[model samples]
Target: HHHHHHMVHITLDRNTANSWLIISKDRRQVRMGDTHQNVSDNKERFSNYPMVLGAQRFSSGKMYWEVDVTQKEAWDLGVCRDSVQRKGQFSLSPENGFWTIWLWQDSYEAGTSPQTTLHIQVPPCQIGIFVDYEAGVVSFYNITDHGSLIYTFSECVFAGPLRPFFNVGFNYSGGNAAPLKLCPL
Candidate 1:
C-alpha cells in the first residue's frame, strides 16, 4: 500500500486504438465511435480488443494515472506490456501482461484468473491506476471516494515495457456515447 503523490501524464496512443474507438484530439479521451471507420488491419492494432495504449511506456520507477468514466456505462482500465498480442480477443489478465479492472452492467470485476467479482458500495466515476515496475506490482484505486483499493496485481513479471491501456467495451447504438477521459492528476 504505497501512497502516490505524483502524476505520470499520458495520452492515448492513437495508433493503438481500435478503429471503432474514437480518440480525442488531445489524445487523452477515448470513446466508442458512433460508426465503425474503414481501417486496415494491423498486427499491432487491437481488432476485437477495443482499447488503446498510452503513448508513454514505463520500464522502471513508479507511474500513476487516473481515468474519468463519468457518464460511461462500460469500461476497463490499467496497464499492459508492449509485447502483448493486440490482434485477437484475449482475456485481460496478468498472464497476458494485462492488469486491468472492469466495470460493466452495473457490476465491477477484476480481470484476473477466474475473475474476481467486485462489490464496490459507492459508485465510482473516476478510477486511478498505480504501477511500480521494479516492485512488480500494479494497483487500481477508486478515486471517487478519496482512495479505495479496487485491485492489485503483485509479483508481476515485466520483461518488456508497460504502457497504460483502456477500453470502453463494445459499442452499442449510443450505449457508450461517453468517452473515458484521462485525467491530469
Candidate 2:
C-alpha cells in the first residue's frame, strides 16, 4: 500500500448526460510520466482518467475541449478564472526566449495563471472542466505568433461554484484499445 487508493470519477464524455468517466478502482496501471505525469510525490491519486479534453464554457458562448492543472503539487481537481488575481505559484523554463515555439516567458513568478501564462499557438477553441477541490487554481492561454500578436483566447471563464468536466476520454469504454505506452516528457 504505497499511495492511498483514489478513484477519480470524471465526466469525460459529457457529449450527452449518458457519457461520463468512472475510474476503475480495483485493477489499473499508473499513467505516470506518460500521456500524463504522476507528479504526486507522496499520495498516488490516479484513477483511469489521464488527459481529458472536450466542451467548455466560454465568454462568447461555448466550445469543445477543456483541461485542468495546478501547482500545489496535489492531485486536487477544480477550475475557475478570476479578475487578474495571483491564484497560484509556478516556475517555468525562464532560460528560453520566444524564437519559435519556445516558452513564451523565460519563467513565470507568483502572478496570474490561466497555464502559467506560458502562451502557446493553436486554433479557436473552447474550455470546460470538472475539478473537485475547492481552492484549485485555474489558468488559460492568450497565445500569439512570431509577430507577437494577440490571438483568439481569453481566461474569461471560471466563476464561483467552480467545476469543469472535459470529455474526449473514458475509463471503461473501449477497454484498452491500444497498448499502454509510457510517454515520458
Candidate 3:
C-alpha cells in the first residue's frame, strides 16, 4: 500500500548475463554457477563480471523495485544506463552510468566517484530501489528496516534508457551461494 503504485516487475535478461551466472527459469533470480556456461557470445553479454541487466528498460517516469539480498554475503543492486559497458573491467559508479550499492563481505558502500561507505543500524534483508526519471534521482531503502532510507543519488543525468542491475558475486567457497531474488509487488 506504500510505494506499490510505482512498483515495476524486473526480470533478468539472460542474454546480458555473464556465462558463469545461472539465471532462473522465471528470470527473477540469479546466482553464480560452478562452471562457465556455454552461452553464445554477444555484444550485450558481460564478459568479465558476474552481472546481469533487466529485460525491461526505463526511459521516463517513476519506477520502483525490490530485491532480496537475504543471507547473501556479496551482491550488487541498482540501475544503469542502457549503453553502459558490457565487456572488460570497468568501475561501477555514477560516472560510469551505474548508480549502485554493493555489499562485499561485511561492508556496504555506494558506487559513487569515490565509493561511500554505509553504516547501517540494521542490516537489510530486502532492498527497495526507486528512480525518478525526470527529477534525476535514484534512491535506495532498507525494506527490512521499516523502509528506512539508505542512500540517494541526485542530479543524475540519464542520457538514455536505464536497466536494473544485479551482480551476484563469486561464490566464496560456497559462502555466498545464495541467489539474488527479484521481489514481486
Candidate 4:
C-alpha cells in the first residue's frame, strides 16, 4: 500500500501501562507478567486493564507500525484516543475511543460497536497497523500474508491525539506468554 513513508517507530510508554504488564527495556515489547509491579497508581497508568500505549502521539498525517504477534494466542492491537479510559471496565470499541482487533481463543474479532468476527485463512504472525488521521481511518494488515487486509475502522471522529494501543491479554497460565514486539521499521 506504499505506506513506507508513513512508517514510524512505536515504543511502548511505560507510564501508561498496567503494572501487570512487563514492558521490555527498549520499550518495544510487552507481555503479561506473573505479578503486578509496585508502581505508582498515577492517572496515566491503566489500573483495571492489562494494556499500554505507545510513547508517540499522532494528531495529523498518516502513521504506520508493525507488531509481531507470533506465537501469541491472545492479544489486542490498535489505536485509542489519548483520553481513553484507563481506570475501569470498558469495552474496546470506537465509542469508547478504541479501534482494535484482537485474538481471543484462536479467533480474530474486530472491536467495533457490535464487534465483527473475522475468519482469516492464515493467522497473521506480524500485523501492520496504518492510521490516516485526516481520514479518520485505522486499518490492520496481515504482514505474514503479503500485507493482506485484515480489518479497517473508518469515519472515526477523533477528538484528540491517538496513541498506539496494546494488550497482551491474560497470561492464561503462561500459555500466551509470547511478548508482543513492535517491529523495527
Write one digit per residue (lDDT tens) for candidate 1, span 1-185.
35567588899887888888778889988887766766666666788857889999899998888889987778888899999988866888888888889988878999888789987877889998998889999888888877888888899987799989888887564677788998875
Give the per-residue lDDT of model 3 (tens digit) for 39-113: 888899988889999999999999999999988889899999999999999999887899999998799999998
**If both were scored by TM-score, which would come out higher, candidate 2 or candidate 3?**
3
**Can you write out model 4's per-residue Cα lDDT over 1-185, one digit (the tens) per residue?**
67767999889999999988889899998988888787777889988768999999999999999999999888899999999988988899999999999999878999997989997899899999999999999999999988989998889888889999999888755788899999988
Q: lDDT tens string, model 2, 5-38?
A: 2223333212211112232232121122223332
Q: Give the TM-score of candidate 3.
A: 0.96
Runs with alpha carbons beyond 4 Å of true place in candidate 1: none
Better of 3 and 4 by lDDT: 3
Q: What does the lDDT read for residue 157 in candidate 3?
A: 83
Judged by whole-model lDDT over C-alpha atoms, candidate 2 comes out at 0.23
Error of 1 at 168 (Å): 1.1
Model 4, C-alpha of 110: deviation from truth (Å): 0.6
Question: Which has the higher lDDT value, candidate number 2 or candidate number 4?
Answer: 4
Ranking by lDDT: 3, 4, 1, 2
Check candidate 1 and list the clashing pairs.
none
Could you estimate the TM-score for every candidate? 0.93, 0.20, 0.96, 0.96
User: lDDT (CA) for every model shown?
Assistant: 0.84, 0.23, 0.91, 0.90
Tell me which of candidates 2 and 4 scores higher on TM-score: 4
